[PDB]
Amino acid sequence: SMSLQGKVALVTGASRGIGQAIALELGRLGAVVIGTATSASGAEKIAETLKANGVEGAGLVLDVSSDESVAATLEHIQQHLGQPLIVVNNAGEWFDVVNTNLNSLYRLSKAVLRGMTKARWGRIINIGSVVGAMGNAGQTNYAAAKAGLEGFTRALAREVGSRAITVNAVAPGFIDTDMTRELPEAQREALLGQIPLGRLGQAEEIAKVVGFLASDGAAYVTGATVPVNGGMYMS
Amino acid sequence: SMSLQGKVALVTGASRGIGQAIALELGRLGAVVIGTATSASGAEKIAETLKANGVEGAGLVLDVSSDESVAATLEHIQQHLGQPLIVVNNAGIRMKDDEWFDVVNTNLNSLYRLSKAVLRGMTKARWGRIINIGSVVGAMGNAGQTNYAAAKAGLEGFTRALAREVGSRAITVNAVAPGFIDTDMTRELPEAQREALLGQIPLGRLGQAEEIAKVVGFLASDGAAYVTGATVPVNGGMYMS
Amino acid sequence: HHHHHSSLYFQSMSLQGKVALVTGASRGIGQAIALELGRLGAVVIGTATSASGAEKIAETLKANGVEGAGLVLDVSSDESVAATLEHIQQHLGQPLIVVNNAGITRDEWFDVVNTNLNSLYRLSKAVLRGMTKARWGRIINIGSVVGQTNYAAAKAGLEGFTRALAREVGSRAITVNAVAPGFIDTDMTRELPEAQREALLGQIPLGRLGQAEEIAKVVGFLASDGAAYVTGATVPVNGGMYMS
Amino acid sequence: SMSLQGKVALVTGASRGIGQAIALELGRLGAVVIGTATSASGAEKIAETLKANGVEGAGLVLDVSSDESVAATLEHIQQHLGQPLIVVNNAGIDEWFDVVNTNLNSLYRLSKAVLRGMTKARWGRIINIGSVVGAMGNAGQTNYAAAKAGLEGFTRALAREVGSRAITVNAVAPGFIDTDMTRELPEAQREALLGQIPLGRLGQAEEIAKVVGFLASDGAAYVTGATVPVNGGMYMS
Ligand SMILES: COc1ccccc1NC(=O)Nc1nn(C)c2cccc(OC)c12
Ligand SMILES: COc1ccccc1NC(=O)Nc1nn(C)c2cccc(OC)c12
Ligand code: NI
């Protein structure tokens, strides 16, 4: 009813924080999890983490900005493990950052669509950027990235829906990660001040949401961006 | 996990469709489920349905537009079953484009009336889940569009505001905005009108009451503890606003 | 101590001896909107909730060469609305431009938004008969100036209401729009200290507070024949500072 | 002063419809109007149209997808006519993705290039014109919603970056406008369309233009980051 048994899940940028937590959550729901990183040591770290948590799968090196890397990586997964029917995009000034992030969502999403099309089933879930950056530049970039993600996600959902593939996004707020743990105190406090719940979110709390979107029970949810921000809305 | 043992859940308008499906889903997750209706026969029906599905709880008559009814109904639940920490608001009242105001004005007043009443219990427990269910697309033309967009936008704003006011107490407030769900309206449409309808839905199909329910089920859980102020669309990719 | 007060040459301004009702016109934004519509040549009835406010409105219009009147109107009251419109109809003519700027203030967010929307509806509904007969109309709703919770709520209530109404009365060539102000320079903001001012300005791209007059120009353009295809819209006037 | 005397305005894609109407409107408000097209005959047509309407300015060939063409064209305007302080982007240079990606790249390319002049003058108006509903049905809805949402986010981001220089950046999101697309509808097909528009009519190119005309002015100096819908009450998101 809430299981992912027999499903292969690709999770990009799974070596740390949110990506790692998503990889462990999909594993717990019984998915076979391929987590990726951009380096060999990261791929092996991913592999050791899955092992030590009893999750089947693999760590591999993937560069999401490269067609060659995407194409070859998929070929690898297809030959060895199977066709990924769950894909979580978590692998990443303002214009180039959003332009490049969306180009890579598209590049990767397009590549996995052939497999989901053949299976008449799929879950693509895009993870947004965490709140955290410094001053007004952080605010501008964050709002832009989020709005880019919300529009892209809806458009894609609309294009691939007749095949029973859902496309959704998770827009995190102020989350406790390695990046946020070492923020200056005042930038941390200011941010807590804007959060109704009065606390930072855990990586795990993003992961549960992804977990539910991956499931059969979220089969009528598509085109949606689920904010996970403790009531803090920054636009 | 996702588990609701030891939790009492109030589900308003639980006699049919979405409300019924939510009541059964919360029950399945182990909640003690009080479903309500506006009539005695509806309360009876709710009770028979819960019984026949092995869900503990009750069917009660509740009129959400009445302070007396709200106050008395809560007292009854408190004395007999316990303090509801999960509350799902699904009780709302030739469709034209001038009906929107009455409908939205009335529905929001009653969300507020009911939400305010259960907050005392959730405040004391330092935990809570309020989940507001939006209206299904009620009709097909322009009047249908206007009313639906208005109800949804009223629900989105209300939900966010309330989430902001009660968040420091670890109470989350969220909404589910359904799309085209299989309703008697959607069943007794003309045939040519039905395919045209499906054509405007990327998924190419009507949604099941159960699919709304799973979403509510997840919002009720501990894993949705950092989700608040959100409106989760459940519409198969069909966005009317 | 009257509850109504007053204020060949042929003008050639965008508003054609069109009659405009501007609620809450005694100060700031409302006053500025009343003067702007007047400058565009409208006959301006500004309202307040007290006799002295209506007097002040009338003196202000006079001293700026705007024809019209200051009237006492309570927008939360059907009696007051109904009677006030009758009075404008009998004496001055049918208001085809209406700017809603009368909102009260202080579990409070709900009552403020609930009450303000009920009054927008009450007043809008009442003027619609006149605009229907004339096959033309402009309703413009002014949002609240900036706290965060209340502002985001008021704004979202206004955006949805405005759009729904626009949809209901569009076939009659009546447009309905809103203006969502940001941080506007007022008496409340002028007396912010040295320290609290910079922090505020820092969150505004333009690096400055908005003037009441800048809201007014926007209303002025929405009132005109050139904004005839704009309806259901909420125009943010906030210097790039977006809070939701 | 809701006028534009002594101001130079660049209007891209000014040979027909919305772009043409914007060029004439800015001219009427007293601006010196450089309208552009992607072909020589279009630049010619632009020049003859401005002349016959008493508007000062020029018709130029500009390809907005090309850095060479942008750079050279600005250089030509600067040397010969002056620095454009009002710029209206109206040029259009798994369809949805490439269209929006390419449109935004070209808004950025062009916006960046004119910013030097506006930065120096400490004043500027960039106005981005969205796409008209391009077809009916599902593909039409998807592409239109995507273009619009891309335009709304971009416009807000840019407004944020250049705001301290007193440059405003806004967008106009047209609905169903009377242009070639709607002019060639069948009979049953157009009434159905009008039925979904509260105003019960198509918009005129001129009505987009008045809105741009107001955004260009001093009275819209506190409006920035905004997308003004001009759609007769017909909202497709
Ligand atoms: C007033 O209730 C609110 C509290 C906080 C945030 C939003 C709202 N309400 C709204 O956003 N909208 C509406 N509130 N009410 C009472 C309405 C009545 C008719 C139509 C409405 O919005 C389309 C609203
Ligand atoms: C470059 O895109 C942006 C820059 C600044 C702020 C927002 C955006 N992007 C968007 O809002 N949307 C989209 N941007 N891009 C490059 C897109 C590509 C395909 C679909 C898109 O959203 C509809 C966007
Ligand atoms: Ni030369």
Coordinates of C-alpha atoms in Angstrom, one line a residue, chain A residues 15-18 175-183 203:
Chain A
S15 CA 26.4 11.6 -0.8
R16 CA 25.2 14.1 1.8
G17 CA 22.3 15.8 3.6
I18 CA 19.0 15.8 1.7
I175 CA 17.0 22.8 6.7
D176 CA 19.6 21.5 9.0
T177 CA 22.5 20.4 6.7
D178 CA 26.2 20.7 6.6
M179 CA 25.8 23.9 4.6
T180 CA 23.4 25.4 7.3
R181 CA 25.1 24.1 10.5
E182 CA 28.0 26.5 9.9
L183 CA 26.0 29.7 9.2
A203 CA 16.8 16.4 6.0

